[PDB]
């Protein structure tokens, strides 16, 4: 009857940015007042459609992508951006229809001594296309020597750990990101206000 927005935001567990979870939501009336009019949203930008008129819009299908990144990396999530996240981890098209919402999660996702349970992809031989996710651990071969599963010697494991700690500046603190995409396919519409 209602879209499970509460399940998506207020969840006990959040995935790392490289293995970003996607949940397809469909056949549910959506109340966007709670999402739009909620406290502690460090970032909330909608590109395709207006948040004012968001509540009365109607789409075929809506996807909720959710993951965790650093504070300095929240700016990269926008369309047509570049970085080690926008290129090797999570990419949005320039025809983006939807919203990006983020909030400060320093209490939940930062353990004293370092949270090494949250990772991102550092090295990769090609930008991925939008909405594509690579979970592989194949070693990045930087040059002549074939890696062959052995790291070092111009060969590294391709994922780095964020390493959150409580005593970190806001920019180096973890943030919880939820990206909402409106598929608007050539089919019967199923979700709206």
């Amino acid at each position: 009857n209602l879209c499970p927005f509460g399940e998506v935001f207020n969840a006990t567990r959040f995935a790392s940015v490289y293995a970003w979870n996607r949940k397809r939501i469909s056949n549910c009336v959506a109340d966007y007042s709670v999402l739009y009019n909620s406290a502690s949203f460090s970032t909330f930008k909608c590109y395709g459609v207006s948040p004012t008129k968001l509540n009365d819009l109607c789409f075929t299908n809506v996807y909720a992508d959710s993951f965790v990144i650093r504070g300095d990396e929240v700016r990269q999530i926008a369309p047509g951006q570049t970085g080690k996240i926008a290129d090797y981890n999570y990419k949005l098209p320039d025809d983006f229809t939807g919203c990006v919402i983020a909030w400060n999660s320093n209490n939940l996702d930062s353990k004293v001594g370092g949270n090494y349970n949250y990772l991102y992809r550092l090295f990769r031989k090609s930008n991925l296309k939008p909405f594509e996710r690579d979970i592989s651990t194949e070693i990045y071969q930087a040059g002549s020597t074939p890696c062959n599963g052995v790291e070092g010697f111009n060969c590294y494991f391709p994922l780095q750990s964020y390493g959150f700690q409580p005593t970190n500046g806001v920019g180096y603190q973890p943030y919880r990101v939820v990206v909402l995409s409106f598929e608007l396919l050539h089919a019967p519409a199923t979700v709206c206000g």
């Epitope: 979870n21 996607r22 949940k23 397809r24 098209p93 025809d95 090609s126 296309k129 396919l185």
Partner: single-chain antibody, 236 residues
């Protein structure tokens, strides 16, 4: 290393219905996804629809409104494509090819491109987004040839190249914009810049003389599309 043996040839009158079935032997069926391409006689490759069996998700090209329906039986490890309201224009060879896919434990799937093709099934009956591909390029037997492929959705989606020698099923030689399959030799190379992709053949042989088609999906990624085609013949 998985093979596909599609069913035998069929003949029907206009208005009939044809079922074509390609058994896939080897590997694990639930891991793969399948799609269907038809080759009009003497004309380019044409995609109809794909299916992901383990999720039971299938989408078809918009030109076949409801005539075609794709299904599969994981129990039998076969894929069924069924066409109805047959017409003469439907006369073609129908290929069934394995799409290498990625399926997530959350509702995520990304389709990629067709790596393994079936022998083929010839069926006879009688009674808005495009990839722009140069129709034909010729090149000298020691030189290098560059074939382009241009659509406005190419930053959003990947591109794949298939080599169709005459009287042959297509063979994937370049995938994911610029990747090298284990089979195709080192001379084949790919590259993408903006809304332009090129296929590169180093020191082209006379072996490498065939039609080449670039396949990529819609901006939405819902429909795949094929290039008009390119005849590379190496001039003597």
């Amino acid at each position: 290393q998985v093979q596909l043996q599609q069913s035998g040839a069929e003949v029907k009158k206009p208005g009939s219905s044809v079922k074509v079935s390609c058994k896939a032997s080897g590997g694990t069926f639930s891991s793969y996804a399948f799609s269907w391409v038809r080759q009009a006689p003497g004309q380019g490759l044409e995609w109809m629809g794909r299916i992901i069996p383990i999720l039971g998700i299938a989408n078809y090209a918009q030109k076949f409104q409801g005539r075609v329906t794709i299904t599969a039986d994981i129990s039998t490890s076969t894929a069924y494509m069924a066409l109805s309201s047959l017409r003469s224009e439907d006369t073609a060879v129908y290929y069934c090819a394995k799409v290498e896919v990625n399926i997530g434990m959350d509702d995520y799937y990304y389709y990629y491109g067709m790596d393994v093709w079936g022998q083929g099934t010839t069926v006879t009956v009688s009674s808005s987004y495009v990839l722009t591909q140069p129709p034909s390029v010729s090149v000298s037997p020691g030189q290098t040839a560059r074939i382009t492929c241009s659509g406005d959705a190419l930053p959003k989606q990947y591109a794949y190249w298939y080599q169709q020698k005459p009287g042959q099923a297509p063979v994937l030689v370049i995938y994911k914009d610029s990747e090298r399959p284990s089979g195709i030799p080192e001379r084949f190379s790919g590259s993408s810049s903006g809304t332009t992709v090129t296929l590169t053949i180093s020191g082209v042989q006379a072996e490498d003389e065939a039609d080449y088609y670039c396949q990529s999906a819609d901006s939405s990624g819902t429909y795949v599309v094929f290039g008009g085609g390119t005849k590379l013949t190496v001039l003597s």
